[PDB]
Structures are given as C-alpha cells and as structure tokens.
Amino acid sequence: TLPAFGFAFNASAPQFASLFTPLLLPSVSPNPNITVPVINDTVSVGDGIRILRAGIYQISYTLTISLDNSPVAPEAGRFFLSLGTPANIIPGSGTAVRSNVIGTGEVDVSSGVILINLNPGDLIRIVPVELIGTVDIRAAALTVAQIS
Amino acid sequence: TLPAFGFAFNASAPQFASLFTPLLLPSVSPNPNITVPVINDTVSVGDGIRILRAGIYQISYTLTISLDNSPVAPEAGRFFLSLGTPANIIPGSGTAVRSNVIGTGEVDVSSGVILINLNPGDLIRIVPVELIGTVDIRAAALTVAQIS
Amino acid sequence: TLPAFGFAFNASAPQFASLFTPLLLPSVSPNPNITVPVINDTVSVGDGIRILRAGIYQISYTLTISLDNSPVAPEAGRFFLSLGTPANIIPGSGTAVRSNVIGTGEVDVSSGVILINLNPGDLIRIVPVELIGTVDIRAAALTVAQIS
Ligand SMILES: [Ca+2]
Ligand SMILES: [Ca+2]
Ligand SMILES: [Ca+2]
C-alpha cells in the first residue's frame, strides 16, 4: 500500500502570527503543469492536516518570516507543530527567530523536520506559542509523509 | 521496488545568485567513508535532478546564504524549486531572506521541503526569482526521494 | 519490512556549541499524547543516532541558534553531520550562520536535509566545525529515515 501523505501550503497570502492560532494553509496543489492535490489518506482542513491512518510520519514545516522591527524592536516568534488543540505542542518540533534590536528589514527562513507516531483523527498544525511584535509570515508549508 | 531518489549538492564552491539561473550542484557523493553516488532512477545534470519514474516525491533544498551588505544594503533573495524551464516555479517551495539595512556580515540558512507528483523527464532545480544585491550562495543541496 | 528510523532531539536544555563536540540529543519521544520512542532498528546514544541496518537514509537536522553578540560581535557557527569520529564530516550536510557585526539579539534557524548510504555501526551526529564566539544552541533535532 502506498504511504499516506499530504502537503498544505500558503504561497500567496501573508498573515501575521497570533498566539496559539494555527497558520492558514489553503493550498494543496504545487505542480504548475499537472496541478492536483498532493493528498493520500489525509485531509487538508485549511490550517493543517488531519491523519486518517495510524503510522509513523515524517513531518516538516517551512516558514518565511519578516521581522521588520515595526512597531517594536526586536520582533520574535517561537513556533511548534501541535497535535489536536493548539496548546498541545510537539516537543522536538520547536523553532524560533528574533531580529536584531538595531535597524530594520530582516527576513528569515525557519524550517523543522520531525518523526512521530500518529493515529486516526490527529490534527497537525503550525502554531506560534510566543511572539514579540508583528511577526509577518510571508509563506508557510507543511508536509506529512508516512514512513512505511 | 526501491524508491527512486537522488541527492545533488555544492559543498566547496560558492556562487552568486543570478535571476532565473539554476544553482550549480556538481556533487552526488556525500559519504566520506564509502563515497558513491546517492542516485537511484534519477539523473543529476549539474544544476539539478531529472525524474525518470512517475511518482510522488518529497523534495528538499538547503542553502547557506551570505548577505554582506556590499555593494548595497540590504541584500535579499527569493528562491523556488522550478519544474522544467527556470521560470516555471513550484508554489509551496518558495523561501526568502533579507539582511538588515544596517551593518554587515549576516549569513543565513534557508531550507524548504515539499511533496509533489512528478513525471518522467521533469527537471527539478533551485532558482532565484528575485534578488537585491550580490547574494552569495555558500553551499546548496537538493534531495529528491520517492514516497512509495 | 518497515523502514528503519530514529528521532533524537533536545527541546528543553540549551547548550553552547564547542568545536568538534557533538550536540546533545537526550529525547526520543515527541508525541505529547502517546509519548513513546520514535525508534525502529536504530539506537539513540545521547548525542546522535547509530545505524543498525544497511540502507539509504534521508537525514535532517534542525537548530535554533542564538547569536547575541556577547562577548564578541559577530558570532558565527558552521555545522555538519558527522559519520563516526566528529571530524569525519559529511559533504552536503553543511550549514552556517553569522550575526550582524552591529547590535544584539539575533536568533536564527538552520535546517539541512541529505540522502546517504549508511552501514551497520555508523554513528550520525551534529558537529560544530567552526565557531566564533559563544553560539547558543537553544534547541536541536536529528531525524534518520530509511528510504526503502
Ligand atoms: Ca513587524
Ligand atoms: Ca553582497
Ligand atoms: Ca554569545
């Protein structure tokens, strides 16, 4: 049987990060020639991916983060993957960024990869858990791929 | 059947990013003890990987990017994976970096992971699509692994 | 047969980077609901993962790096995965970060993904190979997943 997988992303709609608020991931169709959902036995719900098949999964997320130092300097965010409710964070999935206190204009990329046992009904989302300032998420992506 | 895969990288030759110009990836042999091509039913062409087998693929890329703020400040780059011609970018694969307008010396890492349906003949490359300044790509890497 | 895999991380104990000294990765159990080792035919040794099964592996690492510019500015680190002894670095796995020479407070994420042929007894670890200053590794993670 082909492994379960899913890919959800936001390529064209920046969003500001809010505490314990899952990032929006409206798209599932990355190939520009044969443009179809890259989904097999998972469900993209609009802010993440729901597992339908118990198994071991490799999960990645990638964020492009603009910390322009307005209206406060520095700006910072700490992000995790969450299982179910947004506060139910996954240790091992955390990443964090912070700008310099001087100047303006920094844009950074955070990406993380984990492996995790998951079960039917588990909802995987990207959640900001600590924020300073207005943290602009220019793009976001979430990959889920069963190891089998 | 073993999944198709390929790994192409540039570990020892920095290159400046140019618009719509695929990054050079001359090496395929990462193990320092048993130093062999990590290639199975793909082809490394020198600036990316060509697919030979239809399937679902997890693709990653990793870049170490020096934005020294010379000759302009800030410096910035936006990168995507491309399918076929360099302008045929893959939504969901984008990353971007930008230095502070003040000071000098920033070096950043961008990494992205996607899942994508691909077909025989598809050529996957890393492409800069927007640039400010002289963006020094100190190291680059591209992984392609079929999910099957 | 299910692919070999392992996940080792450090979520709750920052460590400063030292030359040729593998980063500490004490945890293997990321799911907060069903909290179990995500290990199959590998061994987590406390500073990395030992391979038990010959095969092709996708390996990732993710670091959250604080470069506060004290006691020197800038601060910088270059990291690789190592095979066996810490100086036996894997070309293609390198990443590097450096702060601005001005100001303070930068926190960056580095993540890298490779594919590699590996053999029983191979020990995979994350190693700093060049350092400037006191480079604070706030969190670290290492994924190993056989492609089969
Ligand atoms: Ca802001
Ligand atoms: Ca420059
Ligand atoms: Ca320091």
Residue numbers in the entry:
A (entry chain A), B (entry chain A), C (entry chain A): 20 to 167
Can I see the authors' text?
To further investigate the nature of the BclA-BxpB attachment, we determined the crystal structure of BxpB. Although it was confirmed by mass spectrometry that the protein used for crystallization contained all 167 residues (data not shown), the structure included only residues 20–167. Each monomer folds in a jelly roll-like structure composed of two antiparallel β sheets, labeled A and B, containing six and five strands, respectively. β sheet B includes two β hairpin motifs. The top view of the trimeric structure shows that the β sheets of each monomer form a tight core within the trimeric structure. The crystal structure of BxpB also suggests an orientation for BxpB trimers within the basal layer and a mechanism for BxpB attachment to ExsY. In either event, the region of BxpB proposed to interface with the BclA NTD is comprised of three loops, two of which are involved in binding Ca2+. On the other hand, when BxpB trimers are incubated with a peptide containing residues 20–38 of the NTD of BclA, they form a complex with an apparent molecular mass of 55–65 kDa that is as stable to heat and detergent as either BclA CTD trimers or BxpB-BclA complexes extracted from spores.
The exosporium is a prominent bipartite structure comprised of a paracrystalline basal layer and an external hair-like nap. Each filament of the nap is formed solely by a trimer of the collagen-like glycoprotein BclA. One of these proteins is BxpB (also called ExsFA), which is required for the attachment of approximately 98% of the BclA present in the exosporium. In this process, each filament of the nap is attached to a basal layer surface protrusion that appears to be formed by a trimer of BxpB.
